[PDB]
Swiss-Prot record:
Superkingdom, natural source: Bacteria
Disulfide bonds: none
Entry GO terms, CC: ribonucleoprotein complex; ribosome
Coiled-coil annotated residue ranges, if any: none
GO terms classed as biological process: translation
Protein name per UniProt: Large ribosomal subunit protein uL5
Listed NCBIfam families: PRK00010.1 (NF000585)
Gene: rplE
PANTHER family, sorted: 60S RIBOSOMAL PROTEIN L11-RELATED
Assembly and oligomerization: Part of the 50S ribosomal subunit; part of the 5S rRNA/L5/L18/L25 subcomplex. Contacts the 5S rRNA and the P site tRNA. Forms a bridge to the 30S subunit in the 70S ribosome.
Length: 182
RNA sequence: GGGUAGUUUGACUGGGGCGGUCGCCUCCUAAAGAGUAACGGAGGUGCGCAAAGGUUACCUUAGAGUGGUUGGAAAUCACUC
């Protein structure tokens, strides 16, 4: 059995058809879809505290399911007293089935558990179908336990879509039921 | 141990002294092969690396704009040029 995420089932069985009708696309897979979700977290203070970076990496692992990579400093800078090549950030890429499952978990479970959650700004679009927005308290995810955290942390989420514009991606996200603050 | 004796105590230098310089490497002067002077104009150097060497395989920056927890002009992430 090719086990399939419920999001993938929902997409393939409805969303393709509604978007074809709604945007008069000539051929079927002119329809937008999702290629990757990038979860990033920038801990510049890790240059003092290694525990911060280790905790962030581990908490990302529990949140998603796959291990993270610690990015390095592209350029040595003094304003943040950064030496080139130091460990500064940590990111995870989600694709395919894991991507769909994580987005389902997020939209239905973790966005609800945010303090004063009143939707998400439906305008954080880079003009090319890529939607990036932040979450300040990772504790919204029930996966991580409260006691073991060493410092409350946030993280940025970027959703990359095959769409050529923002309208297409916003329509796809709305069909997915993404709680945009509107 | 200058009581006594034998000697040394550089050169370049718009006179000599004083100052500065003395080997090697890069550019200009150098007039489109090479070479070419001045106390002409700007710099470096008396090392470093057990990989920062050898080879195989795979990747591509910086900048500007744009969307983003602290994050600000600028950190990390994504896209366009």
């Amino acid at each position: 059995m090719n086990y399939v995420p419920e999001l993938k089932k929902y997409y393939k069985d409805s969303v393709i058809k509604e978007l074809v009708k709604e945007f008069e696309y000539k051929s079927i897979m002119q329809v937008p879809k999702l290629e990757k979700i990038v979860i990033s977290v920038g801990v510049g203070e890790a240059v003092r505290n290694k525990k911060l970076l280790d905790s962030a990496v581990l908490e990302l692992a529990q949140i998603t399911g796959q291990k993270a990579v610690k990015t390095k400093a592209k350029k040595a800078i003094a304003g943040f007293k950064i030496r080139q090549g130091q460990e500064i950030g940590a990111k995870v890429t989600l694709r395919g089935n894991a991507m769909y499952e994580f987005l389902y978990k997020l939209i239905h479970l973790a966005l609800p558990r945010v303090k004063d959650f009143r939707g998400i700004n439906g305008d954080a679009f880079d003009g090319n179908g890529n939607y990036s927005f932040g979450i300040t308290e990772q504790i919204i995810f029930s996966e991580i336990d409260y006691d073991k955290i060493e410092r409350i942390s946030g993280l940025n989420i970027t959703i990359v879509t095959t769409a050529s514009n923002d309208k297409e991606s916003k329509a796809l996200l709305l069909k997915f039921g993404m709680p945009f603050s509107n």
